[PDB]
Amino acid sequence: DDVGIMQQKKPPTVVQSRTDVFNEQFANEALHPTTKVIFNGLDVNTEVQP
Amino acid sequence: KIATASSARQADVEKPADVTFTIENV
Amino acid sequence: LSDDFKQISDPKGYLTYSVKYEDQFTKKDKLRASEADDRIVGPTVNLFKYGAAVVNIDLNRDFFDTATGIDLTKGIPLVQDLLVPIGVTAGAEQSAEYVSGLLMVLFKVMTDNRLVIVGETTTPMSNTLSTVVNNVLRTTYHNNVGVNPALLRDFTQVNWLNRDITNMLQQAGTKYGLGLTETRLDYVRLVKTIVGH
Amino acid sequence: PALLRDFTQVNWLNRDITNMLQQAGTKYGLGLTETRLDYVRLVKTIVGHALNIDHFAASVLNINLRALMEANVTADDRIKALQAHSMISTQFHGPNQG
Amino acid sequence: DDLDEGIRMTTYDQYLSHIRERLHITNVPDPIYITGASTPDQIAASVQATHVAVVLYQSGVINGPASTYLRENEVLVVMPDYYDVVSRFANANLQMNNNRYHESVLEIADIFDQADFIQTSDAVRQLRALMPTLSTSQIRHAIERIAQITDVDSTDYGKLTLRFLGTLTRSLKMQNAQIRRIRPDGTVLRYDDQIDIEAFRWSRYFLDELQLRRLSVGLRLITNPRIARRFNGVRIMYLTDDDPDPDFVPDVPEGYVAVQYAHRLFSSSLANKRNRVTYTHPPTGMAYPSPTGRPHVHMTINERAGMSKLVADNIIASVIKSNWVVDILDIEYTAEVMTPSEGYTQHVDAESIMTAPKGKLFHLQFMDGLLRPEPSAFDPPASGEDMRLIYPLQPISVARSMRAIVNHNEVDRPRGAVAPSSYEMDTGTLSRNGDLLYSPVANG
């Protein structure tokens, strides 16, 4: 029950793009859990508060 | 550092009886 | 004579214990114990580091070495070209490779004609080692001990345990205790006596 | 001084120690005691130790931490304050607001 | 009264094979015949002789009591092939019914009293049940290659040679043998004591006795839950990857219907131009072209060998958007349950789970999950969820002895943590023989 501290490893992020009209043929859907990010990378949260 | 993974199996030694030259009881 | 047996020193069972430890945990209070008891509860607790996640009872290649086929690795024994489909070519990583891993192995157990010889046992006496471990020990424990969940009691930090051990080897049944017991045979002879370990 | 008992030759002592940490009061004991807090958190738990250290100096030590524990500075709070510094209406999104 | 509380009866072939040769050796006059007439007395007298409690049936209805006496006594009755096996008995009160079974092993020893022939155990049916039925040619090979590992180079073993002809090779199947001595007319005599050795009456398996012992001990080991590490049926289900224990199979909600997969369902029809591969849904014909919006179906796959690389994918596709739960019941893979710190590698993709040959037993690997440390209190929030598909249909992790050796908050046991089982350190005495047994529980 303790804050990370170290640097654990996470399930690779496959980026979902979802464009105006996208075509949906998930035939390679990798089975091991994965995180799907809709917006190109962009997590933007950088303003360290010393 | 980046939190590693590690495995260890339980050792195993079974030398084949070392013939000795000493009794130990009269 | 007729070599119908092999006297080996410290035997190697079939199943073993194999532990995987997330390597980032590590209680920092350091527990150091009697130099002697660090030798009984030596490997046991050491293998049982603080932060091992899943612990499995494999079959152990140490005894089922590839010298007989059964190439373990995966939990499955998995022999090899034992019962193939005559006329073709195996089938890379087939399923029956395993019904068969199970066969040669039953077969190995089928013939483990090996005898045992007390080997480099040691005797520590009370004061040298701890009270807890001491009841467990009945005198002259084999020098090349093994590993075993109990005997890891009150020697391990994992605080809950001493609820499932210090209160496990507490019930009526389950009286642990390595060492050198009295085996009905005790003084039977041969070409040496027989001790019971 | 105590903890030096029955470990020191000065024979009279074990009259003023082995019979000092003998009275009702004065129960010595370094180590790691149970401090009412025990499982209180922070960014780590708090353990209670009893090092040998004088008490003026230690009371002071007790005071900083015990007090730090009582001034909940939730970061939603730092943000609210930081909010104060920027083009009146600007949106701040970050850590849970607690 | 249910399960293992009625009448037991076994097929004549089973009786012949395993139980019959033993009867010949004890001498006791062969069994009796369940006949329509025979009263509870005849059955009693017969078992009073053979003293084995088996009665052979070959006469119309069993009727009247006795059949009842049979409930009172094991007296498994052996009979030629099953069917109408209720039309045989006269259950004058409807209970018997050609469809109520607890097909059981009945470890032979619980029939014979002179257990000096009986050996091994029910543990073998467990094992041979797995062997893929082999052919005589097949066994020549299994044996030829075992002997090879043993180092005892075998040749012309089991074969023949005779110059002039070829080296035509006999078969090798043999099941159980009896080195019975044949009357001149070339046809097996019934083993007689005062004419043939006493080392032939009932030949173990041609395995020296000492050798036979580590074998009951071994098969005992082989047939052990903690070494059954080759599982079956995966479930494919869409979901949020949240659960520590890998031996966690997402159960199915209330709505979902049970549909046994088959080729008959997925036709290929036209809808809005395009040939959407409509699925029809048996319960009420309603072809649903587009994957999205089908109707809460629980897909069960047993086949999986006749899928087109697309009908199947579409079904998998529908799994995603429709939460269809497809259970692939025929796969046999081997788990791993390997700690979070170095998570995954061998990547099974959905296309493969679906088209893999029936043989290939592929390695999968579930997450350990429990030993992952809490994420920070300032960790940049994660936006999109993790999706997980493959699940194990049966409880994995059996090999697991203990797991989660680490304090929770310094006293409470983390959830999912195991602690070793008592029996795995109850090291008790030895019997009044040799077999090492546990410690009494204070009751001998």
Add this chain to the structure above:
Amino acid sequence: FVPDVPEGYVAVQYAHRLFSSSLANKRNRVTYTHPPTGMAYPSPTGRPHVHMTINERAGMSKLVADNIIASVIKSNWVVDILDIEYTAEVMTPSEGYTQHVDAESIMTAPKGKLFHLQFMDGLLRPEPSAFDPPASGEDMRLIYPLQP
């Protein structure tokens, strides 16, 4: 054609207050907190049916957006966006698309920007040969004009 928002739906008003970030099971989800009965929903998969109306689209972290557009998907949410301004070409099934307003931005780009999204005009579409075997990706569109 403009998608009619179904029956069982709640009309939800979009205040910045709703999408509080917040720890929820070993990780920090972006828990949206449904106004009718103020109980939070840690992920997109839960989330009840919401018809969520977006007018400022001013603050709203790039991050809060990844999630809503993203969850419209996973949970059938419908977001109704109004301070957009986009012309709308209507090319025929022959020059079928050459744009694709990526939602990254249709979702979060200056309050001005006038993107030219473009619908298809399927009516002169060819009806697939009565026999040929099917193909298997449904093709959809995640943005519909809100007015005729």
Add this chain to the structure above:
Amino acid sequence: QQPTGGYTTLEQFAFTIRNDGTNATPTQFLQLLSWEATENELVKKTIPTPETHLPSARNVPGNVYIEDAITQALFGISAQNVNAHGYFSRLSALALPNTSARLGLDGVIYNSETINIPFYDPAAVANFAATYAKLGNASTPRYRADMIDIYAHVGLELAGTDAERAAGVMPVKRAKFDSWEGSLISLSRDVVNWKILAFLIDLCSLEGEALRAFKTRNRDVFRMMLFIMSTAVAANVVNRKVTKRVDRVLEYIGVNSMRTAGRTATITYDLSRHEFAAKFLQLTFTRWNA
């Protein structure tokens, strides 16, 4: 393997605590609380009758520690990952007409002959797991307990003077008391330690006349059960000074604030933990009322 007559009210199952150090049966500790009322009201509504369908019984290999786990989660100190089916799918079994899994006295689940461990009556526990298995649902989307309405109940149930306020309404009361540094948490753990099952198995069994006699007997053990539990949720908690003595002050005793950070003065529900407690209360309450 002992019957009943009331499962609690039997030595082993006593409920005590720590009054800065002593013990005192909870009733004795709750009589040391004070409520300043403050606008609003907590109009109790109606707990939505349970989600009848419970998780499927999956064998699973192991000894599900249930008393300990259920509580570690309810008023623990952080249960890492609560709701996981694993522990409940298994607990479901116990809810069948005929099984082996006996519920071990200490608070566990076994097979065939548990051996040594003197489990509970097989019937009592039968009625028990009947409902408290559903508890392994709170996780799933269509069964969430929907918590802020439920806390309305917790309140006139905990505070709110008898009868008077036991009439559907009352003002959120900001609760305060003479504490003793790290009071709330130290107190909670005395409770994590508590033997819950003894309380429920008895609550989900006892006939009807006896049931009421029992409701009164644990009126307080139960109020205490959730006082420490509600403070997990109640917004701000600070210390009000007085005259050398300190008085812990609790934001609002009834208005769950759906806060998930980690205070210091108290416990703290991760988000999913609310998913759990919310559900647990739905059941105990539907049950407490009958």
